[model samples]
Target chain A: IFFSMHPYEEEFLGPILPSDWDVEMTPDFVSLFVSDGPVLEALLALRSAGYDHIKRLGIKVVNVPAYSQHAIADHTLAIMLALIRRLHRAHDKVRLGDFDLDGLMGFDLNGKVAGVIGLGKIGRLVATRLKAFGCKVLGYDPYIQPEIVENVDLDTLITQADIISIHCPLTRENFHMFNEETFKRMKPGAILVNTARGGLIDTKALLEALKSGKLGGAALDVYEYERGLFFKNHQKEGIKDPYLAQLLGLANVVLTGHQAFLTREAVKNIEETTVENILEWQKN
Target chain B: KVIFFSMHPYEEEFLGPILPSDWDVEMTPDFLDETTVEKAKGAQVVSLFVSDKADGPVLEALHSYGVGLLALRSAGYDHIDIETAKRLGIKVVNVPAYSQHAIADHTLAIMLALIRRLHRAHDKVRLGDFDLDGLMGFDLNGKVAGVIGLGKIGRLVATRLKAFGCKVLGYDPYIQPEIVENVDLDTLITQADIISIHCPLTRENFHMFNEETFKRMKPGAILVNTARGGLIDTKALLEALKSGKLGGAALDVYEYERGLFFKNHQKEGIKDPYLAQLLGLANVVLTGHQAFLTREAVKNIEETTVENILEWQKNPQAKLK
Candidate 1:
């Protein structure tokens, strides 16, 4: 029997993998992170290589969905505040010895409306945290919980929120959810924050939205083409993605390298969950 | 008639509409220097920002110009020579507690920015460098936050931090105990993962955050100062940052910030080495004394300045004495 550990191989299974493996033999089981998984081409190649013996493909995606909820929520709020308060621009000015308050004016988060997409653990956490800032939170989740948030439709969330943060997973129904038409539906000058999945938002439409001043600002942790790009240093070669380069050119947009779940607590949970998945599969 | 000195366009934007519609007013971008004293010559009252210092000579000049009232558009009047102004018959009134929320909010903004490494992240994004290797940050919740002062601004900061689920520890010789846990200075410094300064600058308390204080603090603790710059020793702060005695610093005030802040010197170059060194460090976040630049604070400052000037004009002795 053979199992594959891809996402956390470098971190958790570094000492375990490469020492023992059966490349030619069909693996009885496989394990991968939800984000790194669906490596469709790799899976196809494995199946094609006489891997009919492979019966179970275990997903080490249990604890991460809950453990990283707060971390992602915190990062979302951090970027949202950074955008609204113009912290990035202000820091840039101060670094250059320019303290003049010309373009550094920022509005307070108090009394503003925040529309949250998806009401899962991360989305719920984001909404609750915004409520602490005295922001009116309107959540848009198909599985609505009225006690947790004021349920609103997708159009209302887009049109009414001063800040819109996406926390939903990428699915066939939600893929490219924030496209040109969706951008048009959003309130002009509203900020967009995405910490969920890259495929949920259309990068080309986001660039257009920012250029047209329809979106006030954007803070993204995940980019559409982040699979090979993210978690890798691109400073030397520079990013080849024109959409990413254009998005980076805007001062209002803040970009992080998919580090929303890179906190100590969240990463530890991921490691434990990955190890647990392997052990549980062995027991079976 | 009032002359608003050291008036940047931002200050004018907020103060203009709030001032009396018929009141005689003159706004100048110049500080209270030799060249700018001529502008205050004919005005009966002069509204000043922190940048304008009314020292012995400036007070004498203002007194000579029949400027009986010196209305400060700031909470801190440390720049004003109160004794000299009193002797020169210049009644000084400051707008104290002008939007504590603004300062509190700014404190959080910088704290979050530094914690999240927004400074590095933003710079990286600009250069098309999207690497997430060293940008890891911890949650503010379940952390101990030590506040140096328990005044209005400090109290508000404590409350806000508390709302974030922080164990807020405050130290003030004089304090409202109910607002925060009144721990001793040593205990607060030693135990807190984050410490913020909101105390007033005084001769005894100047350079309070020196080598000894930094040594006493948690080795990985972050520091924030939205108060007076003199409260921190710039040299000691640089040393701590270099030695990793402190994790990070977010400063809106520097000890040598008087002539530097509220002005653009990017082209001419900043002459101060300590400031330049601090700016060079990646962990240090700097803002040009803009913690009090919010619209709410600006409006409060303007309203208070107008009231102080009008009241001084109505009965000089009653308010001044």
Candidate 2:
């Protein structure tokens, strides 16, 4: 059995591991594996690293998805509220004993137009919450359509939405979907929230949009190149990733270490599924 | 002549043009006080913000100036004395019910921020720490939400929580609201996963969420108060948070903030250890009473102040005629 190096992984997955299968130092070993996140990505990386012999070994893969659907939706609203209310700036100011409300003026969510880029289960939940806050919900999903949201083209949704939340999975065909061209199409001073895959947004392009004041703000729970940095504490060594460092410096940007799905409920669901899927194969 | 005290320059850009033509008005970026009341010696009416005082002594002085109307550019008139106004034959006109929506929106903002650990994450990233340790959150879906008050703001909060799939429970002594199950305070405190305060601070209910109430709360339940500060005792909340009995809290107002908020106290820092310790807690998110500060709320404040004066010219009651 293999082990994780990160702190939270140890905190969450360490205790829930099956007792019959012993994994030590959480050792870095490769075998038939089970993971909490994106098993598909881990498998692809394994194959690229000249581990194609697994095909001959006849190893089976057990995957877990759709566990954090509601968790991600709930986090998306958290980021949206954080952006619209300027909660970060207000807290920073008040902690510094600066109670000046200057540069902290927030707009009401009641009349704002909110767009959900993907109308899947998670995206639909986000649309529902925004509508409850009195937002006019717009949606854009090429494959699936939702009942309550006004489905529109990519361009239409981008231009009209005051707040744009990205929920689509990243793909080869749609990587860097929110690059320079798309940022230009977004409503001036529009806010962007991304709780989905990091590859969906171009970090440098987002930084530019925020610097130019074209996009009002951004709240990200994932970063495009977060694999090396996320799930680990880098404060002592300091950030080597320029884009992430700059994003942290910008007043309008709010960043959380890919924790959109880090809820107790979602973790419990993950543990349940990992056990359930393993039982079919009848492995201890 | 109508004298507007505590007027900011930006407010004049819109408020000045909206005034009726052929009216004499004096405007200043100064607050109304014993010293400033000298400027309003002969004013017919006066408008002011929350920071300006219209208390007992000021009422007598304003009455001496024949200041017939007290047009407040805010929804809250707690800063103004109603008893003194009536005795001095002065009509107090305030923009009542400007936008409870702003406060309600902020209430949810604090909740989401606390639950998701936005501040903790932000604090970590500032130091280049991307670790989410002690930052795991809970989903609002399928959780129980208890609202302490069912006023307009609380009702709005209840509906919004329902949108997120929370089982909403609300309690109010005076009014029963729809869209939520009506429960007593005891039922709500023990059963809810998240409890938010939307009630006012009355004589009978000060320190309502004290040590006794904190003990009854669902262990690790989040507590949010965007209403008045006096509702929750600061010392008791500090104990609850430190002991890990309560999950977390987000406060926008504090009971001992009279000399602290709305001005700069950064030089000496916070004097009270309770407030200082509360600030140091990772689970606690606090704001400086700016939840009601919004664009729409401000515009409503401007619009309502204009209505009060124009309507009060030929009338005594601001809303009646």
Give the winner by lDDT.
2
Candidate 2: count the clashes. Answer: 0
Worst 10-residue stretch by lDDT in candidate 2 chain B? Answer: B312-321
User: Which ten contiguous residues of candidate 1 chain A have the minimum total lDDT?
Assistant: A43-52
Q: What is the interface RMSD, in angstroms, for predicted model 2?
A: 1.8
TM-score of each: 0.84, 0.88
- Candidate 2 DockQ vs. native: 0.60
Alpha-carbon local distance difference test for all models: 0.76, 0.80
Best by TM-score: 2
Model 2: fnat (fraction of native contacts): 0.75
Off by over 4 Å in 1: A1-65, A146-148, A153-155, A175-189, A198-214, A282-284, B163-165, B172-182, B202-204, B314-321
> After aligning candidate 2 to the native by TM-score, how far in Å is the CA of A230 from where it should be?
2.3
